[PDB]
Design an enzyme around this catalytic site. Structure first.
Site, mmCIF file in Angstrom:
data_model
loop_
_atom_site.group_PDB
_atom_site.id
_atom_site.type_symbol
_atom_site.label_atom_id
_atom_site.label_comp_id
_atom_site.label_asym_id
_atom_site.label_seq_id
_atom_site.Cartn_x
_atom_site.Cartn_y
_atom_site.Cartn_z
ATOM 1 N N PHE A 283 11.366 -2.610 -11.210
ATOM 2 C CA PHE A 283 11.069 -3.438 -10.043
ATOM 3 C C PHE A 283 12.333 -3.947 -9.355
ATOM 4 O O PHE A 283 13.285 -4.365 -10.018
ATOM 5 C CB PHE A 283 10.221 -4.657 -10.464
ATOM 6 C CG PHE A 283 9.973 -5.669 -9.352
ATOM 7 C CD1 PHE A 283 10.827 -6.770 -9.176
ATOM 8 C CD2 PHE A 283 8.894 -5.513 -8.481
ATOM 9 C CE1 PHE A 283 10.606 -7.691 -8.153
ATOM 10 C CE2 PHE A 283 8.658 -6.428 -7.452
ATOM 11 C CZ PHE A 283 9.514 -7.520 -7.284
ATOM 12 N N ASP B 55 10.502 13.108 1.052
ATOM 13 C CA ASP B 55 9.942 12.122 1.953
ATOM 14 C C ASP B 55 10.700 10.802 1.947
ATOM 15 O O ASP B 55 10.098 9.718 1.804
ATOM 16 C CB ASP B 55 8.459 11.899 1.616
ATOM 17 C CG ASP B 55 7.761 11.030 2.634
ATOM 18 O OD1 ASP B 55 8.110 11.109 3.842
ATOM 19 O OD2 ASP B 55 6.854 10.272 2.233
ATOM 20 N N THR C 17 1.901 5.433 -0.485
ATOM 21 C CA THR C 17 1.398 6.637 0.165
ATOM 22 C C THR C 17 0.327 7.319 -0.693
ATOM 23 O O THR C 17 -0.417 8.173 -0.206
ATOM 24 C CB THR C 17 2.549 7.640 0.465
ATOM 25 O OG1 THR C 17 3.275 7.913 -0.737
ATOM 26 C CG2 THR C 17 3.514 7.061 1.506
ATOM 27 N N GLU D 265 0.875 -1.156 0.000
ATOM 28 C CA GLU D 265 0.000 0.000 0.000
ATOM 29 C C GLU D 265 0.915 1.209 0.000
ATOM 30 O O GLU D 265 1.610 1.459 0.982
ATOM 31 C CB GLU D 265 -0.869 -0.002 1.267
ATOM 32 C CG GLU D 265 -2.312 -0.531 1.122
ATOM 33 C CD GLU D 265 -2.420 -1.982 0.666
ATOM 34 O OE1 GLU D 265 -3.532 -2.555 0.750
ATOM 35 O OE2 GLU D 265 -1.407 -2.557 0.212
ATOM 36 N N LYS E 253 2.088 1.529 -9.939
ATOM 37 C CA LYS E 253 1.488 2.344 -8.889
ATOM 38 C C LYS E 253 0.238 3.098 -9.355
ATOM 39 O O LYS E 253 0.279 3.871 -10.309
ATOM 40 C CB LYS E 253 2.543 3.340 -8.358
ATOM 41 C CG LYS E 253 2.037 4.364 -7.328
ATOM 42 C CD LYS E 253 1.448 3.692 -6.077
ATOM 43 C CE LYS E 253 0.889 4.690 -5.042
ATOM 44 N NZ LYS E 253 1.899 5.320 -4.100
ATOM 45 N N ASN F 293 11.157 3.397 0.999
ATOM 46 C CA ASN F 293 11.312 3.700 -0.417
ATOM 47 C C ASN F 293 12.750 3.653 -0.913
ATOM 48 O O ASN F 293 13.080 4.270 -1.921
ATOM 49 C CB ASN F 293 10.606 5.015 -0.838
ATOM 50 C CG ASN F 293 10.993 6.211 0.011
ATOM 51 O OD1 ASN F 293 12.150 6.374 0.381
ATOM 52 N ND2 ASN F 293 10.020 7.075 0.298
ATOM 53 N N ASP G 153 10.534 7.066 -5.784
ATOM 54 C CA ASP G 153 9.620 8.209 -5.625
ATOM 55 C C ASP G 153 10.192 9.619 -5.595
ATOM 56 O O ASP G 153 9.550 10.542 -5.086
ATOM 57 C CB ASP G 153 8.729 7.975 -4.404
ATOM 58 C CG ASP G 153 7.905 6.712 -4.547
ATOM 59 O OD1 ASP G 153 7.415 6.172 -3.536
ATOM 60 O OD2 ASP G 153 7.751 6.251 -5.699
ATOM 61 N N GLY H 280 -1.413 5.195 -3.317
ATOM 62 C CA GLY H 280 -2.312 4.159 -3.792
ATOM 63 C C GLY H 280 -1.675 2.783 -3.727
ATOM 64 O O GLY H 280 -0.540 2.644 -3.281
ATOM 65 N N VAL H 281 -2.397 1.761 -4.167
ATOM 66 C CA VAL H 281 -1.852 0.414 -4.130
ATOM 67 C C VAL H 281 -0.726 0.238 -5.156
ATOM 68 O O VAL H 281 -0.707 0.889 -6.205
ATOM 69 C CB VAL H 281 -2.958 -0.634 -4.394
ATOM 70 C CG1 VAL H 281 -3.394 -0.579 -5.854
ATOM 71 C CG2 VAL H 281 -2.467 -2.030 -4.026
HETATM 72 N N1 Z04 Z 1 9.575 -0.356 -7.535
HETATM 73 C C1 Z04 Z 1 9.447 -1.398 -6.652
HETATM 74 O O1 Z04 Z 1 9.884 -2.484 -6.974
HETATM 75 C C2 Z04 Z 1 8.815 -1.209 -5.418
HETATM 76 C C3 Z04 Z 1 7.880 -0.147 -5.283
HETATM 77 C C4 Z04 Z 1 7.184 0.127 -4.054
HETATM 78 N N2 Z04 Z 1 6.359 1.134 -4.044
HETATM 79 O O2 Z04 Z 1 5.943 1.678 -5.185
HETATM 80 O O3 Z04 Z 1 5.946 1.678 -2.932
HETATM 81 C C5 Z04 Z 1 7.452 -0.740 -2.894
HETATM 82 N N3 Z04 Z 1 6.881 -0.613 -1.713
HETATM 83 C C6 Z04 Z 1 7.746 -0.502 -0.487
HETATM 84 C C7 Z04 Z 1 6.989 -0.826 0.810
HETATM 85 O O4 Z04 Z 1 5.707 -0.226 0.732
HETATM 86 C C8 Z04 Z 1 4.909 -0.975 -0.160
HETATM 87 C C9 Z04 Z 1 5.375 -0.658 -1.586
HETATM 88 C C10 Z04 Z 1 8.397 -1.794 -3.049
HETATM 89 C C11 Z04 Z 1 9.089 -2.048 -4.282
HETATM 90 N N4 Z04 Z 1 9.954 -3.023 -4.384
HETATM 91 C C12 Z04 Z 1 10.575 -3.745 -3.226
HETATM 92 C C13 Z04 Z 1 9.633 -4.823 -2.738
HETATM 93 C C14 Z04 Z 1 9.094 -5.792 -3.593
HETATM 94 N N5 Z04 Z 1 8.229 -6.762 -3.187
HETATM 95 C C15 Z04 Z 1 7.892 -6.754 -1.870
HETATM 96 N N6 Z04 Z 1 7.078 -7.650 -1.470
HETATM 97 N N7 Z04 Z 1 8.351 -5.864 -0.941
HETATM 98 C C16 Z04 Z 1 9.218 -4.911 -1.404
#
Ligand code: Z04
Length: 294
Positions: free
Chosen positions: A78, A123, A14, A12, A33, A128, A141, A16-17
């Site tokens: 990712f 932030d 800041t 989740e 996102k 992040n 971000d 959206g999902v």
């Molecule tokens: N760009 C990305 O690969 C990515 C983006 C966001 N995001 O856009 O926020 C994010 N969050 C960080 C924690 O908050 C939820 C979302 C985590 C990411 N990757 C690492 C990751 C991959 N899978 C799992 N399960 N946990 C972490």
């Protein structure tokens, strides 16, 4: 969407999902996102689009911005893990110093790059900062805050953390400088070393007073102009500054010296990312690989 098979909900955000998704046409796996409400500010889209050109090895790449259907989707590179989760998993033994140093070094390179192009994050937090098996760490971000602003609660009502917020922001400054990111990174640096958040406030005043209790209540000597800040009150309690040797033990003097410069009260005195990369703390920096269990 329709060009993406949702692989899993990553979390989740800041705004959206966030889903892990596979581009059906190119097979690439990305992070998708969904951002927040009646049309989406065209100013925001011009600003975000601009970020597609902000490319650096330590910055999570923005692959695409999609507005169609009057919803906003951001497609990002990712990475498998975030620093918050990695720290939780390393709590028992702590992240080895060479790895903490390598991460800090890379994070500063990313900040130096964005800042040189006049883009601030605003932030930064462990959640992040994303990592891979190769030992790389990347900032996610950058620039979104300026485009969407930072809310008190996320779309899910979760409270956005104040732990990494610079004091000038807490005191009501309207204009943020690149110094706010250096402050945040300093707090994260301290947290990696001690394995405990540095200033875990649970309200704006609690956050501010936790900073004051550790670094001393600021005054005109250490921070010219502070008593004129919008939210400054002559009634703030006056706490004496603590010694760093007590704040981030058992970090060595190179480390404590750098942290102290990243946590200077006056944003103008706070070390820049570029200058921090030259600090003697990085003399023996290396690039170790994390023990990542995926
Ligand atoms: N760009 C990305 O690969 C990515 C983006 C966001 N995001 O856009 O926020 C994010 N969050 C960080 C924690 O908050 C939820 C979302 C985590 C990411 N990757 C690492 C990751 C991959 N899978 C799992 N399960 N946990 C972490």
């Amino acid at each position: 969407m329709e060009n993406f098979q949702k692989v899993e909900k990553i979390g989740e955000g800041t705004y959206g999902v966030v889903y892990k998704a596979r581009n059906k046409l190119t097979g690439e796996v990305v992070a998708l996102k969904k951002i927040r409400t009646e049309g989406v500010p065209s100013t925001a889209i011009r600003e975000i689009s601009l970020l597609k050109e902000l490319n650096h090895p330590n910055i999570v790449k923005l692959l695409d911005v999609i507005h169609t259907e009057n919803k906003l989707y951001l497609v990002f590179e990712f990475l498998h893990q975030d620093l918050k989760k990695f720290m939780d998993a390393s709590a028992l033994t702590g992240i080895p110093l060479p790895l903490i140093k390598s991460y800090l070094f890379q994070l500063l390179q990313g900040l130096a790059f964005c800042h040189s192009h006049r883009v601030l994050h605003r932030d930064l937090k462990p959640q992040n900062l994303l990592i891979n098996t190769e030992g790389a760490i990347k900032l996610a971000d950058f620039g979104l805050a300026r485009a969407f602003g930072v809310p008190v609660r996320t779309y899910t009502h979760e409270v956005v953390t104040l732990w990494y917020r610079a004091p000038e922001i807490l005191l009501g400054c309207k204009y943020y400088s690149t110094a706010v990111d250096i402050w945040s990174l300093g707090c994260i640096f301290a947290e990696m070393v001690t394995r405990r958040a540095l200033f875990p406030g649970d309200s704006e005043i609690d956050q501010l007073f936790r900073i004051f209790r550790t670094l001393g209540t600021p005054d005109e000597v250490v921070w010219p102009g502070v008593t004129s800040m919008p939210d400054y009150k002559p009634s703030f309690p006056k706490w004496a500054r603590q010694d760093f040797s007590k704040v981030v033990p058992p970090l060595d003097e190179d480390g404590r010296s750098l942290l102290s410069q990243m946590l200077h009260y006056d944003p103008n005195k706070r070390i820049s990312a570029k200058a921090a990369l030259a600090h003697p703390f990085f003399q023996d920096v290396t690039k170790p690989v994390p023990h990542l269990r995926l």
